[PDB]
Design a protein around this ligand. Structure first.
Ligand SMILES: [Cl-]
Ligand SMILES: [Cl-]
Ligand SMILES: [Cl-]
Ligand SMILES: [Cl-]
Lengths: 258, 258, 260, 258, 258, 282
């Protein structure tokens, strides 16, 4: 009978693989997926928000850049408790939605649904920074090390090799990380970081030019950082501090422009 | 002392035993009861809603049909924890509310308030159905087998005898069930089912005529299905898929018509 | 490009001609028609609400009782301006809705869509001036009439206010009587008057609008034998409604959230 | 016939003549008045708000200081058009409210309900100031010259004698004024002004000490500025930039503390 | 004293001239502009909404493609009425914003703020279309014929040459147009059109490829359609059917992501 | 590790030490603090609310009367879990707020952010400057523990003057003796006063943030007059205990060992439901 109390913040990385698919995807998301979602989980989800992605930056393709948005949930219980499988009303969800997001063509790309605890486990740079300090270019990135790579070795590489370069860049204002909760849904990702910049240029200097300094790992799946396969072992997005799509509080139906 | 995380969904079957009582009962509910209620449980109830009952279908008097509404709470802790008995402000509660609901006559019917897990336990027909598939006539029935009936003999009857008639009838779109949490407020009921149709006529056809086929149990409290004493061992409502009285989000005070 | 300030309150009498249709009709209303309607007029309507019907009272059918709802708009401009015909997005409107509402039969006779415009404020207050919401719950009988073809309007008017109303006035069972003339200029609505007449309950409504009204002389223009002497759903429509509705749509709509 | 478009902002100056009345007056205002008011004008009043008064400063009694609030309305039609007299449901108004606000005595104070254009007619000091410039002590004052006093002679006094001193005082950051629309409801007041300060000390220095320099006019009803009979020909309140009681958008019923 | 009822819908084409300015401009718009704006016009503006631009399509540069948003207002009175110039709280508006939007440079582009009646004046293709007919790529374009060009010539060319190509394209689902109200704020534009396609490729086929057919007029400010100077004599944006930024209804302050 | 379920109601006694600070402190509260706060805890706080103070009554000073407001949070986890010390965006929280609330004396440089080693906010709410008054931030269970007078009173029974008071017994005073005193000498006088309509009490959850206070009580009246008649005039009857930090009841050092506010039944500042941004007056 007992359902465990399990506060988590989860992230889904939502791509759009053609600009021709965008109107339709965005339609589905806002006209259909929102009300289905709320209808199901209003009683045990405290927050449901979309953070629309900034335009893909140069070489964003290599970071598995989600060209549509990030979907953020805050959970009081595990969505993967199997007792939750049962829904009186199920979502409306055509095959097409996967085509649009890139999960299948018409291999594709996996669906990345990452669970984290609600507060960051590590604060590595920018402790104490307020909203009055200014507008942020928030690059959220999640990585998963390829098959047969020691998780401790990946971590050592991450925090003793990658992060230090972010700490050295004055153009990087904030670094946060949390370990992915793998027991929840067997997400392949192991880490979620958020790295902040003043703007797109800042982002480029650090994640492309500064990282050229890095040594190509033995397990490297691409040539340059992040050395992980785009959309499979690395997804990301750049977002603003604010989103008007805080959905449990603000959604009033699919109102159309006149 | 700790308070247990006990997420639940509860349902109250709120009758109205005379049309001349309707404006008064209804007034009290929407003008007084909502504010008192929200004031008390806002911090530990995630959803408070009323689902107004469709008008009483033929023979529904035999199923304990709640002529006013279904009342639905979603809890984070148990309302029956004795520490919750203390409140700064008690509900304003005129004794006439009990007359209006048929609790006393000015013999009377018991206050039915069933606790459940937030997710249905059994999914027996229509798995996969979405809102895109059309409007449902949702028939919510709760039952409690009489004193001195084996609960398992009754469980067995319910699911090996009754449910299959529902499964067989093309007029029924959906059958969900969940056992009543009996350890919370000694509710006399043992089960809650929601059984969907397309309309009142289909409900009648399946729940009256198809049910004729059932042999009458030895414990039967009336001659035909549900075989239980209306308002006492069976209550029910038929309701829409949508209610606009989702009270934590949409209550704006008792705004009077002009 | 000059638009008339034209504040008004309109009422639509929505019926549901069979219980089997109600789920489908109610769905459409709250799932489809609200958002389309809001999308269209949000900038020049200040309120937009539905008041569900209490269940149909006895002999309620002879009053053109709307078994679904009153739909109420407050406008700042006339919706029947021809410039307002054009809209980027048009209503999603299945033919079936006309079946559900009774406007056409299904495969015995079709009832018109009644859409009546009024001033925002009641024109005549004929009983119960000063009654507050503290005075108790109201059973609100909202009723619109339109005298049939060939009857002098002034004669009808005088009959309404010198014959019918004084019975409402006499009856202690009736707490309130309000009336307004229908703005007929706007959209040629067949109705001439709208009244709201209040009781404590259905029992009260019946005693007055049925039994007290038996004393009324049958008019020569009468379309049925007893008050209101007008053809149901064609020359009289009505509903009985509560003081409050949770369906104040501009303030309170959150999308079509489904029960679990 | 036509209803004229008439966009106006009204102010009402709500006193509370004793601290033992504050709980009852406030309860009536926020529990009964709001929803009676909203119910009536929701369709033709675009905004309805209360600005609680700041604690009455020294000598504020002499300015006819509202110890409850200012009550602001924005109208699209004149509330005084006779046809607006008729209303389904009447304001619930017990006589005590008059006692609480001092309309009827323990002599009475009149009820001061002044109509204005929605935009200030005169901007006399501090045009250009934004909210970024800091928190304002907003002293809203209405005055009405007494019977017999020539309206123009008074206007000239106000603008050529009184204002100049506000303009000299660097403690005052803003002076706005508008003639009262007398022709709506025969309000006795002639002008409403808002005069801003950093804080109470500032309001004092300027509106008491600096004003001692003015000569006492022949028509004076008291010895010191404002020279007008308190609560009868002069009312005021000091209020903050922001109120949480923007009622048309924020009221969600009389929810009570636990 | 009288104020004309002047219902109208207006549009601002908000560009953003470099991806490095986006965070800052976004922030200001949503953190500062919204609350300043609402404070000011809540009582006489019934709708205030932002529709963020879709990703600039190929050759959008040539259409004065606003890279940030359309800002949409619905007014009950004319903002240009000189009595509305007086405000108590002036908007916080550093000149930096004019740099982000491109009004001022490192040539300045003008600020295009076009007034219109609330309902489209010409329905030219696809009358009858509902939301159910599918998602729309909505291309809003405003054009101003350059100095010296007879205005009727301008119109004659628009509706006799340009629109028939839109009508001929099955890729184009809707054509709407309204004349700009010049008499309000001397906006240099003469027309606004919304032209719908299914997606970017449909938009490209018609607005770029099909238009090659048009004859270059004698006043052309650029070799190909729209034959007008970008951002000066033509602005445009492509937007979705829905926006979450319906600000009078949905703003709950500047909430930051966690 | 797991985060424990910990349903709690908490209160902060927010003072304003001079009227000239009021506009500034209010603006900061309403313009800056709310959004920062909501942003932080929206996913695990079910209710964030401000109950502004009624006017300070005669002799309120002696009860540590909070001249601005009560600040009420309802939590699903403990805000003092060390892991909640990490926040993407920290609170804009200048030192001025502490000057204005009386936590620290006036000085230059106070427009600056509070410099803490950990979080500026969590450490600001632990302020305990010798020359100021401490920051009183008391955690309670969500439901009142003891119901001592007035059980069953509804809102139809009338408007309430709700005097909310927290007290903590002085350094080295025996805690069980304080309790004994409170409930066998103080309460009885409340119970005897027909002018007191309600008495409610809960023990402060000390095991959370080290709050010095031991008790929170709410005591209802009809008005200032009745509040005074009972909390001042009736209370003269108490004997002065050996640990007394002032001559008269509550015998406790104001703003240090006693804090209080009187508030209404309703607030419009129920922040999770009602806040639409700092919308300014025209
Ligand atoms: Cl029987
Ligand atoms: Cl007949
Ligand atoms: Cl060119
Ligand atoms: Cl002392």
């Amino acid at each position: 009978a007992d359902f465990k109390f399990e506060p988590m913040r989860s992230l889904i990385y939502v791509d759009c693989v053609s600009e021709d698919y965008r109107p339709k995807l965005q339609r589905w998301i806002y006209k259909v997926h929102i009300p289905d979602s709320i209808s199901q989980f209003e009683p045990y989800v405290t927050k449901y928000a979309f953070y629309p992605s900034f335009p893909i930056p140069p070489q964003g393709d290599r970071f598995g850049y989600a060209r549509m948005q990030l979907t953020e949930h805050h959970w009081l219980v595990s969505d993967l408790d199997p007792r939750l499988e049962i829904k009186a009303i199920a979502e409306t969800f055509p095959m097409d939605v996967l085509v649009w997001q890139g999960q299948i063509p018409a291999e594709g790309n996996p669906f990345i649904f990452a669970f984290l605890p609600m507060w960051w486990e590590k604060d590595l740079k920018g402790k104490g920074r307020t909203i009055e300090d200014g507008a942020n270019y928030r690059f959220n990135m999640t990585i998963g090390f390829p098959e047969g790579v020691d998780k401790a070795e990946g971590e050592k590489w991450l925090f003793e090799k990658v992060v230090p370069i972010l700490q050295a860049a004055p153009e990087c204002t904030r670094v946060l990380a949390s370990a992915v909760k793998k027991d929840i849904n067997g997400c392949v990702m192991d880490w979620v970081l958020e790295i902040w910049f003043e703007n797109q240029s800042g982002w480029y200097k650090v994640m492309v030019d500064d990282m050229k300094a890095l040594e190509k790992p033995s397990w490297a799946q691409q040539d340059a950082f992040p050395f992980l396969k785009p959309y499979h072992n690395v997804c990301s997005a750049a977002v603003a501090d604010y989103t008007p799509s805080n959905n449990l509080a603000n959604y009033r139906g699919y109102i159309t422009m006149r």
